[PDB]
Amino acid sequence: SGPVPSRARVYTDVNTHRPSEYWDYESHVVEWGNQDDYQLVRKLGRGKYSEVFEAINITNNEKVVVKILKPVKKKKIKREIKILENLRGGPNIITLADIVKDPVSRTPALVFEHVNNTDFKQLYQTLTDYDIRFYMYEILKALDYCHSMGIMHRDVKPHNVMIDHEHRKLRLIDWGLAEFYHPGQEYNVRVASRYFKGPELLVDYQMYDYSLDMWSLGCMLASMIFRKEPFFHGHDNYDQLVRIAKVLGTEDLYDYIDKYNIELDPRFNDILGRHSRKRWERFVHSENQHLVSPEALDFLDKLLRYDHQSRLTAREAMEHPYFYTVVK
């Protein structure tokens, strides 16, 4: 009689026990400040619906990041602002400093603390086993905090993680896809980035939770310790599940869909095939061995599981032997 319901194993009712003012973003009143305070310096990147700039705040001569948003959907903008305000000051959460609109354009813009990001393609070959453990723990601080505040980031990936390596500072950014978690709620599965999409999204299982973020974090860990980017290289959303099945095996995939009475889309019929469960050790090679250890593999095995409920929570992950060498 349809799919089996599911709920988060942690922070299940945090939004339920809070007043609507906290989670009802649509009713949130946004106050837009004048944008004359900030002068744009240079473009940092372009999003599908946003443009990010490095900027100078004239009042204090301090660098800031300005995210100009193309207002395609008003509700989405309110959701990001509300979530940013709720999380403001949390560990490793990007800090929303201001919300402004340009006097003439009236286009929405978010102003953030500046983060001096070290090069994505240059950091990959210098990081040691310790650095990966250190930065993975910094991301877990952000995720445990946001999940505790009843929020799912829903877009965890390397692009959304800013690292100032010189100051060992990490920030989880772009909360545009983030959502409040309400037990029993059926969310839109068209979230995250293809390579980081949890099996729950790919099989159209809508009653997902914070555990989605842990799958995405598992994908990032696998790419880093094995030097294989992305780890699961799907060419489309259906092929993405096949790439996962080629590693995790098809037997555990059917156990997952049977546990939640998920109806597998017919598009999977000719592409899924049959795949044995691979051992994590088979991804170890001369180029990545210095980043791999039994602890790293045991930790990875506990994140990359079809069953979202069987994945470690951010707090359980922080207690893993893989992080015994890092300061808590």
Active site residues: 155
* Least gap, CB of 132 to ligand AVZ (angstroms): 5
Instruction: Please say whether the beta carbons of 77 and 101 come within 8 A.
Output: no
Q: From residue 143 to residue 172, what is the string marking binding to ligand AW5 with x (rule CB under 6 A)?
A: ------------------------------
Residue 48 annotated as part of some ligand binding site? yes
* Residue with Cβ nearer ligand AW5 (44 or 132): 44
The set of long-range contacts for 14-20, using a CB threshold of 8 Å and a minimum separation of 24, is 14/148, 14/149, 14/150, 14/181, 15/150, 15/180, 15/181, 15/182, 16/182, 16/183, 18/150
Instruction: Please say whether the beta carbons of 306 and 253 come within 8 A.
Output: yes
| Residue 94 binds ligand AW5, judged by CB under 6 A | yes
Residue 44 annotated as part of some ligand binding site? yes
Residue 278 annotated as part of some ligand binding site? no
Which residue sits closest to ligand AVZ, CB atoms considered?
A: 135
| Residue 33 binds ligand AW5, judged by CB under 6 A | no
Task: For residue 313, give both structure tokens.
Answer: 């929570």
| Residue 184 binds ligand AW5, judged by CB under 6 A | no
- Cα–Cα distance, 307 to 303 (Å, whole number): 10
> How far out from the chain centre does Cα 33 lie?
29
Question: Which positions lie near ligand AVZ, rule CB under 6 A?
Answer: 45, 117, 120, 123-124, 127, 132, 135-136, 158-159, 161-163, 220, 224
How does DSSP classify residue 101? E
* Residue with Cβ nearer ligand AVZ (47 or 249): 47
Residue 73 annotated as part of some ligand binding site? no
Q: Could you please report the per-residue DSSP string of 178-198? A: -EE--TT----S--S-GGG--
Half-sphere exposure of 100 (CA within 13 A, CB side): 20
Instruction: Please say whether the beta carbons of 225 and 296 come within 8 A.
Output: yes
| Residue 44 binds ligand AW5, judged by CB under 6 A | yes
| Residue 65 binds ligand AW5, judged by CB under 6 A | yes
| Residue 214 binds ligand AW5, judged by CB under 6 A | no
The residues of the shown chain that bind ligand AW5, judged by CB under 6 A, are 44-45, 52, 65, 67, 94, 112, 115, 173-174
Residues of the binding site for ATP: 44-52, 67
